Amino acid sequence: ILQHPDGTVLKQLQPPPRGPRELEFYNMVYAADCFDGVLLELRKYLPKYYGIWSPPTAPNDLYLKLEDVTHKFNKPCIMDVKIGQKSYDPFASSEKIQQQVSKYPLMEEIGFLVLGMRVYHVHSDSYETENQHYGRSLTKETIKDGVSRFFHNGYCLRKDAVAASIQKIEKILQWFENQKQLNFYASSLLFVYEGSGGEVEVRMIDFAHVFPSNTIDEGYVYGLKHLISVLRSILDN
């Protein structure tokens, strides 16, 4: 992810088949002649899409030009949460499934995984960062506190941002409960709140494993429901 001062990010296509798949996902969703109500509604929850981009002198080098969801914030606190019970897709080999489940074997049970967070701390004028090992360390016993950490500015728990996050996740959940045409594997929610009131972003990102489907995305729904439940309990802290 490359942050451009113009309020966009450039995401380099991942190697095939992942990068091509994410390009086609955005292309399908933001298709100029799309009148599909499901896809039109979904746009609200994605980064705005500015199409494929490549450097003027390097047509080989493929990027997606996307809205920087953090741009409107002064001191954005950012958390990326992978959603779902399975982070492998319907066409994964046995080896690939094993690889994916071993990365975080609690995915089925919890239905989400914190990929990272960056939290602004007021009293130190500084950022705490947590990497992928943080979330992969969390268990059923420690997931609530693990998530809570995102909402601590070093003096209060930001229950405003927690409540706002629930409210925005609920809208995404409502979208999922009103579509049976896409299933999303190893995709994420990006949470952003203002670390310097109740202003928040929650957006869907990372679409290298989105597939056509005939069914509700039950794993994604489970993940959202559990994440909402965890956030709800944090409101009682």
154, 122 contact by CB (below 8 A): yes
Residues found near ligand YIG in the complex (CB under 6 A): 1, 9, 11, 47, 66, 68-70, 78, 80, 116-118, 190, 205-206
**Residues 176, 180: Cα–Cα separation, whole Å:** 8
133 CB-near residues (< 8 Å, 6+ apart): none
Q: Is 132 annotated as a binding residue?
A: yes
Provide the minimum distance between the beta carbon of 186 and ligand YIG in the complex, in angstroms, as a whole number: 11
Report whether 101 belongs to an annotated binding site: yes
Cβ-Cβ contacts under 8 Å for 48 (sequence gap 6 or more): 66, 67
For ligand YIG, the closer of residues 117 and 162 by Cβ is 117
Nearest distance in Å: CB 46, ligand YIG = 8
Q: Report, in Å, the least distance between residue 8 CB and ligand YIG.
A: 8
Cα–Cα distance measured from residue 19 to residue 68, given in angstroms and rounded to the nearest whole number: 19
Q: Which residues pair with 119 in a beta bridge?
A: 128
Residue 100 is assigned to a ligand binding site: yes
Asked if residue 86 belongs to a known ligand binding site, the reply is no
Residue pair 39/182 in contact by the 8 Å Cβ criterion: no
Phi, psi for 215 (deg, rounded to 5): -130, 165
Specify the residue, 129 or 181, whose C-beta has the smaller distance to ligand YIG.
Answer: 129
With contact defined as beta carbons under 8 Å apart, do 210 and 20 qualify? no
- For residues 230 and 143, is the Cβ–Cβ distance under 8 A? yes
Residue 68, annotated as binding a ligand: yes
**9 belongs to an annotated ligand binding site:** no
Closer of 7 and 37 to ligand YIG (Cβ): 7
Q: Which is closer to ligand YIG, CB of 47 or CB of 223?
A: 47
What letter would DSSP give residue 45?
G
CB-side exposure of 236: number of CA atoms within 13 Å?
Answer: 5
Closer by beta carbon to ligand YIG, 111 or else 135: 135
Q: Least Å distance between CB 207 and ligand YIG? A: 7
Of residues 89 and 206, the one with the C-beta less far from ligand YIG: 206
- Give the shortest CB-77-to-ligand YIG separation in angstroms: 9
Residues annotated as binding site?
Answer: 11, 18, 67-69, 80, 82, 96-103, 132, 206, 209
Instruction: Indicate the annotated binding residues for ATP.
Output: 11, 67-69, 80, 206
Binding residues for substrate: 18, 82, 96-103, 132, 209
